[PDB]
Paper text:
N-acetylphosphoglucosamine mutase (AGM1) catalyzes the interconversion of N-acetylglucosamine-6-phosphate ([name]-6P) to N-acetylglucosamine-1-phosphate ([name]-1P) in eukaryotes. This enzyme is a member of the α-d-phosphohexomutase superfamily of enzymes that catalyze intramolecular phosphoryl transfer on a range of phosphosugar substrates. The reaction catalyzed by AGM1 is the third step in the biosynthesis of UDP-[name] from fructose-6-phosphate in the hexosamine pathway. Previously, AGM1 was shown to be an essential gene in the human fungal pathogen Aspergillus fumigatus and has been proposed as a drug target.
Residue numbers in the entry: 2 to 14, 16 to 20, 22 to 105, 109 to 405, 407 to 541
């Protein structure tokens, strides 16, 4: 590598230790913010290595703990196309975080064949967290020691940062993603939303809970750029970004999804169309209060079916339904009714994949148009190289033209790099405008099987080894046989159990034709899992 550089890395590394042991995973490095200096430093070094390995391409760093409380923070790497860090590279981060101050960077330059000829290039941003300023200061020191070029994008949503990274590495290519600034992002979405909305009108207000996080001021700033006669009026609530303690506190998409209620502080009336973003605004879900005051959730799987229905219809009327392979990508947690709706009502393939955004993104990129959402409200619609060409180059034999126009627009509206709450929100709004649907008519599209999720503490969960999109247990022996036996005893009975990646428990999900059936099925399986976890 270099000797004078290797002395600057060792010297600047001055920070803690702090003796806990780390692992970069699904969520990158994510912990209490006080444990994090040596780790963010290491990611500075790892961003440098990654940039150089990929011929001095821009690598992103996002500083965020997402839905976690204020005391928490995290750090994530973004690869050139705006994808999360390639899986094989997570271990490199791990080695660098644990490995003691004083150098070891050098050992990886040899191991990963990395060219010194290019300077590393790295963009970063952060959410509203209290530790962000100091953590960025750390990141800067690591990128000064390795003589990397870097740009501080300051405060951004997670999807904005991914946007920038994609833009920077696609400028001058055939598939230019846009202007690599915050301004660029808003401009792209506003112009796409004007096109997608041509001749159609939003009805009623949308009350968006912004989790008191970065998504609130960024949404408000996007609203300045949006066009005029769309009918869209957004009411922003929970934007107390000023107070670090307010982040994700009894509001946000994660609260609303996991607790199955509107935020306590919500002032929405009966029939007000509502949504919640998470803290870093890459998760959204809709909800409304019944004509009879019952809370009604329209989660990621519900956005997935809404999107697929709309995209299905457009591809048809655009005359390209046959040329392009369209699909919905789901996990096992997707309500069986959602799957049934996709396959029997929309006549589209559903692919079930492992839990984890990587796996859903990967499966979606196998369709020309791949809709993938998790229930928690993370997801997007993937457009393939092939999809983009045939939308841009099919000649309309009918005024079809309108539909192609609408579809081209959608490719610009829908964030391709990462699932994006603000993007998804405008998507939903555009769909319900085009379809002329209320929240009530969206909900009425099919009925969810009553379902139950349970968290089952065992010691230890590593004996729970699954396959077939995590819908079957190979280990421990006999448990799947019991689970299969149990589910049969109930009408439309479906249940599966898997180790959590993020928590120390196995999760049981169950659904059946009725509330008491689902509940009892879930409990029997939970009991069976506890016995098997002894
Ligand atoms: C960025 C990413 O890949 N996130 C995944 C998410 O896709 C998955 O739904 C969740 C499942 O959690 P679990 O293993 O505890 O059920 O874990 C992670 O947060
Ligand atoms: Mg998030």
């Amino acid at each position: 590598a270099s000797p004078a550089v290797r002395k600057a890395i060792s010297d600047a590394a001055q920070y803690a230790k702090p003796g806990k042991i780390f692992q970069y995973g699904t969520a990158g490095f994510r912990m209490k913010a006080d444990l994090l200096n040596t780790v963010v430093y290491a990611v500075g070094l790892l961003a440098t290595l990654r940039s150089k390995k990929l011929s001095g391409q821009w690598i992103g760093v996002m500083v965020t703990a997402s839905h976690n409380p204020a005391e928490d923070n995290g750090v994530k790497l973004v690869d050139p196309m705006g994808e999360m860090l390639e899986a094989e590279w997570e271990a490199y981060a791990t080695k660098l975080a644990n490995a003691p101050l004083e150098d070891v960077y050098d050992e990886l330059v040899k191991e990963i064949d990395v060219s010194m000829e290019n300077p590393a290039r790295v963009v970063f941003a952060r959410d509203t967290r209290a530790s962000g300023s100091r953590l960025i200061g750390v990141l800067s020191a690591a990128l000064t020691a390795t003589e990397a070029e870097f740009i501080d994008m300051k405060f951004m949503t997670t999807p904005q940062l991914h946007y920038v990274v994609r833009c920077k590495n696609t400028l001058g290519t055939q598939y230019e993603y846009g202007e690599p600034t915050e301004q660029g992002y808003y401009e792209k979405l506003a112009a796409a939303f004007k096109r997608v909305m041509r001749g159609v009108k939003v009805k009623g207000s949308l009350t968006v809970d912004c989790a008191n996080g970065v998504g609130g001021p960024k949404l408000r700033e996007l609203i300045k750029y949006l066009p005029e006669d769309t009918g869209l009026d957004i009411k922003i609530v929970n934007d107390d970004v000023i107070n670090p303690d307010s982040l994700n506190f009894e509001c946000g998409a994660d609260y609303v999804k996991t607790k199955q209620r509107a935020p306590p502080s919500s002032k929405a009336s009966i029939l007000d169309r509502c949504a919640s973003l998470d803290g870093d605004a890459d998760r959204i879900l809709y909800y409304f209060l019944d004509e009879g005051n019952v809370f009604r959730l329209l989660d990621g799987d519900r956005i997935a079916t809404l999107a697929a229905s709309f995209i299905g219809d457009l591809a048809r009327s655009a005359g390209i339904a046959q040329k392009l392979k369209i699909g919905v990508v789901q996990t096992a947690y997707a309500n069986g009714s959602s799957t049934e709706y996709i396959e029997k009502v929309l006549k589209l393939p559903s692919v079930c994949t492992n839990t984890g955004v990587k796996h859903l993104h990967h499966a979606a990129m196998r369709f020309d148009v791949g809709v993938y959402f998790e229930a928690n409200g993370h997801g997007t619609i993937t457009f393939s190289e092939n999809a983009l060409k045939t939308i841009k180059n099919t000649e309309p034999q009918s005024p079809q033209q309108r539909s192609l126009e609408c579809l081209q627009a959608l490719t610009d509206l829908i964030n391709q790099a990462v699932g994006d709450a603000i993007s998804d929100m405008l998507l939903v709004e555009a769909i319900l405008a085009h379809k002329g649907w209320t929240p009530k008519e969206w909900l009425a599209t099919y009925t969810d099987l009553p379902s139950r999720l349970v968290r089952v503490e065992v010691a230890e969960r590593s004996i729970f080894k699954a396959y077939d999109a995590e819908r079957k247990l190979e280990s421990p022996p006999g448990l799947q046989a019991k689970i299969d036996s149990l589910q049969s005893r109930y009408n439309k009975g479906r249940s599966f159990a898997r180790a959590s990646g993020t928590e120390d428990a196995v999760r049981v999900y169950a659904e059946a034709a009725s509330r008491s059936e689902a509940d009892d099925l879930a409990t029997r399986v939970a009991n069976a899992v506890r016995d098997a976890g002894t």
